[PDB]
């Protein structure tokens, strides 16, 4: 099956573009990464950095995860991200998203050997 690390890359990594392409970015992207297949995932963040830069966050600032676990890490530098947020009019299977571009610190949870991101926790 798809590993947790690979699931993180599918859900959250878009190194192809420097920022949110367009107003239509989230609609195209949430569908193509299979985030609208079983339901409309209501919120999702994409990170526009190289994979190496994001994997490096697992050795940056250790912070508590929202769930109380302690394996979360906050990036020291801000990163280019896009938040995708379901619109009020969105109804499965025709999911619809607002696309918002931002530059924020990311918080990810890391596990494994090698120690890599498996969960996007928050942006701050």
Show the domains of the chain with their CATH numbers. 1-124 (3.10.130.10)
Nearest-angstrom CA–CA distance, 44 and 97: 10
Instruction: Given the residues 40, 119, 121, 123, select the one marked as catalytic.
Output: 119
CB crowding 102-118: b at 16 or more within 10 Å, else e: eebbbbbbbeeeeebbb
* Cβ partners under 8 Å of residue 10, min gap 6: 2, 33, 34
Residue 119 annotated to the active site: yes
What was the resolution (in A) of this experimentally determined structure? 1.8
Tell me: is residue 117 an annotated ligand-binding position: no
Tell me: is residue 17 an annotated ligand-binding position: no
This entry's atomic model was obtained through: X-ray
Nearest-angstrom CA–CA distance, 42 and 58: 26
Tell me: is residue 10 an annotated ligand-binding position: yes
Which tokens sit at 2?
Answer: 């798809």
Q: DSSP class of residue 37?
A: S
């Amino acid at each position: 099956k798809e590993t947790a690390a690979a699931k993180f890359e599918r859900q959250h990594m878009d190194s192809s573009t420097s920022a949110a392409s367009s107003s239509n970015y989230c609609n195209q992207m949430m569908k193509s990464r299979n985030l609208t297949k079983d339901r409309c995932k209501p919120v999702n963040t994409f990170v526009h950095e190289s994979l190496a830069d994001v994997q490096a966050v697992c050795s940056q600032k250790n912070v508590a995860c929202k769930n109380g676990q302690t394996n979360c890490y906050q990036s020291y530098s801000t990163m280019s991200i896009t938040d995708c947020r379901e619109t009020g009019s969105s109804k499965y299977p025709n999911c619809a998203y607002k696309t918002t571009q931002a530059n924020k610190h990311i918080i990810v949870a890391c596990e494994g050997n090698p120690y890599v991101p498996v969960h996007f926790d928050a942006s701050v």
